[PDB]
Amino acid sequence: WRTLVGVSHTNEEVRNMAEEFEYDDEPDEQGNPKKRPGKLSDYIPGPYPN
Amino acid sequence: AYTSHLSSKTGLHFGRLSLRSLTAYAPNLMLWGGASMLGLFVFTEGWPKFQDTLYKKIPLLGPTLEDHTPPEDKPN
């Protein structure tokens, strides 16, 4: 997402799209799987899981 | 008159280097120090720490080196 900044959108413009997608977080204190709204450092996710 | 002896001192030396040769060489040694300092000013120009301390203080080439991207199209 961060490579889109300064080419086609602004910083606050890419942060909204990255927050619109969801990724896998580090597991919580009980070891359960956890999701997370994305940041700039993440990658653009594909539609299919495999 | 008549001179029977040759009056001379033994100079000052460290085998090869002499004090006379050092005093004859010393301003060009200062010139080579300045030339090597300009060489370091060349080969350290892209270094942003040396840009912040030294090269942005230059009158006509100083503000030339700094960028003008706002904090809206920088990712970090």
From Swiss-Prot, chain A:
Q: Spell out the subcellular localization from the entry.
A: Mitochondrion inner membrane
Acidic residues: bias regions = 20-29
Q: From which domain of life does this come? A: Eukaryota
Q: Where is this region: Disordered?
A: 20-50
Summary of subunit composition and partner proteins: Component of the ubiquinol-cytochrome c oxidoreductase (cytochrome b-c1 complex, complex III, CIII), a multisubunit enzyme composed of 10 subunits. The complex is composed of 3 respiratory subunits cytochrome b (COB), cytochrome c1 (CYT1) and Rieske protein (RIP1), 2 core protein subunits COR1 and QCR2, and 5 low-molecular weight protein subunits QCR6, QCR7, QCR8, QCR9 and QCR10.
Summarize the protein's role.
Component of the ubiquinol-cytochrome c oxidoreductase, a multisubunit transmembrane complex that is part of the mitochondrial electron transport chain which drives oxidative phosphorylation.
Record family assignment: Belongs to the cytochrome c family.
Spell out the note in the miscellaneous section.
Present with 39900 molecules/cell in log phase SD medium.
Identification of the protein by name: Cytochrome c1, heme protein, mitochondrial
Q: What is the lineage of its organism?
A: Eukaryota, Fungi, Dikarya, Ascomycota, Saccharomycotina
Q: What gene name is listed for this protein?
A: CYT1
**Coverage span on the entire protein:** 112 to 161 of 309
Curated annotation (Swiss-Prot), chain B:
Kindly list the GO CC terms recorded for this protein: mitochondrial inner membrane; mitochondrion; respiratory chain complex III
- Please give the start and end residues of each transmembrane region: 21-44
Protein's recorded name: Cytochrome b-c1 complex subunit 10, mitochondrial
Name the membrane topology term.
Answer: Single-pass membrane protein
Gene Ontology annotations of biological process type: aerobic respiration; cellular respiration; mitochondrial electron transport, ubiquinol to cytochrome c; proton transmembrane transport
Quote additional remarks.
Present with 5590 molecules/cell in log phase SD medium.
In this UniProt entry, which residues form the Mitochondrial intermembrane topological domain(s)? 45-76
Could you confirm whether the keyword Transmembrane appears in this record? yes
- Coarse class of the protein's main subcellular location: mitochondrion
Organism annotation? Saccharomyces cerevisiae (strain ATCC 204508 / S288c) (Baker's yeast)
| Protein family membership | Belongs to the UQCR11/QCR10 family.
What interactions and quaternary structure are annotated?
Answer: Component of the ubiquinol-cytochrome c oxidoreductase (cytochrome b-c1 complex, complex III, CIII), a multisubunit enzyme composed of 10 subunits. The complex is composed of 3 respiratory subunits cytochrome b (COB), cytochrome c1 (CYT1) and Rieske protein (RIP1), 2 core protein subunits COR1 and QCR2, and 5 low-molecular weight protein subunits QCR6, QCR7, QCR8, QCR9 and QCR10.
